[PDB]
Write a protein that binds this ligand. Sequence first.
Ligand SMILES: N[C@H](CO)COP(=O)(O)O
Ligand SMILES: [Ca+2]
Ligand SMILES: [Ca+2]
Ligand SMILES: [Ca+2]
Ligand SMILES: [Ca+2]
Ligand SMILES: [Ca+2]
Ligand SMILES: [Ca+2]
Lengths: 132, 132
Amino acid sequence: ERRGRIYIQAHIDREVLIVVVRDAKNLVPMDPNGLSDPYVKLKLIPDPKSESKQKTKTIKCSLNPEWNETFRFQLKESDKDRRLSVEIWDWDLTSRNDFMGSLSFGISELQKAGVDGWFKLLSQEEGEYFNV
Amino acid sequence: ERRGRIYIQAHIDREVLIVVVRDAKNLVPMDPNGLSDPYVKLKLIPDPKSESKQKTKTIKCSLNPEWNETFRFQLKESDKDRRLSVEIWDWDLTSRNDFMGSLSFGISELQKAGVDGWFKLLSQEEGEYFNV
Ligand SMILES: N[C@H](CO)COP(=O)(O)O
Ligand SMILES: [Ca+2]
Ligand SMILES: [Ca+2]
Ligand SMILES: [Ca+2]
Ligand SMILES: [Ca+2]
Ligand SMILES: [Ca+2]
Ligand SMILES: [Ca+2]
């Protein structure tokens, strides 16, 4: 568990993905002060023009952010071949935000069973394929 | 020690920085296969146009690379206000290489005493300032 963990809750209502991003523990420091400014980015991938994107607020200087935010996604046919992508990023003022941890759930699999618990954060490339 | 450690040897011999990049342990996975393709990038910073850049070879699929490569840098007056920047990157074929760990030593401080040992890898922004 090199990048910490995040507590996610996600299930499908009808054709509506409901995602709850509660909190995260032991995130990796990304700033010179030894901390980071975490915010989570949710997308349905593959997504070209990044048309699905939704973000939580940014928590400043914390390696254990608590967001408690809910998000709704209106699904479609095509989405059955997509994955719910959850990525944590470190907000920076004077530079590209830095990647911190990733995770993803197959939409086809969420329709069969929702999720509610802690997940180990993976690397960005790795997180677009699995969840642990 | 979230990103593992690297064994560095560096000292100055009459205006010449000699850096030995031996090996690294417990690097963080950066690829879908659960590994990474580490290579170290050495620069003297600030160095906007990267005229300083020098790289080790890339070791494929390893979180414990052994490089054993020596590098020489011809110092100057100005370099007394610069730092030796050591960054490990994960080589990727189909995408921007991913950052793995960073570290830096003040050139002014190396002139007073060289280093030879293990160093904890820091985040990129953090690594441009310290060396734990
Ligand atoms: N530029 C960063 C990329 O991850 C953050 O961007 P964004 O706020 O659009 O998610
Ligand atoms: Ca940062
Ligand atoms: Ca930041
Ligand atoms: Ca940044
Ligand atoms: Ca990679
Ligand atoms: Ca790679
Ligand atoms: Ca990449």
